[PDB]
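Summary for the steering committee. The consortium agreed at its last meeting that each partner would contribute one worked example illustrating the joint modelling workflow. Our contribution is presented below. We chose a case with several input lines so that the handling of multiple components could be demonstrated. No manual editing was applied between input and output; the record is shown as generated.
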Amino acid sequence: QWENSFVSVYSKDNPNLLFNMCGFECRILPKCRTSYEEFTHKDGVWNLQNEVTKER
Amino acid sequence: FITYRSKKLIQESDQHLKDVEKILQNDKRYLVLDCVPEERRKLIVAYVDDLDR
Amino acid sequence: PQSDLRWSKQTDVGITHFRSGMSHEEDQLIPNLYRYIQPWESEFIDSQRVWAEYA
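What follows is the complete predicted structure of the assembly.
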């Protein structure tokens, strides 16, 4: 049901990218592709390093 | 280095370098500072001296 | 409050009043439980560092 579902598109216009797993919400955005403001009220920032390149 | 015992481990012996490398195994700067081996050695020595200063 | 840490004991000289350590700033009883959990970032990092040593 669309009233219970939730889509999350991503393109050149939608840099944000939302998740809602069984627990807490989440939003991922790149570090070298015109990132957002990156408020970071707490110290929560997941430096998702590249598996092969080993870069943030 | 968050623990105050990091200075004690550094003053103990060279095993503190191994511990830092195990904790900091994914140091991208360690790969950036790895092309210059003398530079990496000087950086490690300066870090140990600043920690032990 | 710093005015809730007063105690004394009348043993040999008299009621020697004292006070705990609150001269720096206010008393932070529970600053943050987040500091004493080792969250999932530290958990995953320590696991990636520890299970390899275990093997």
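Chain A touches chain C at residues 46 (CB under 8 Å). The CA atoms of residues 2 and 25 of chain A lie 18 Å apart.
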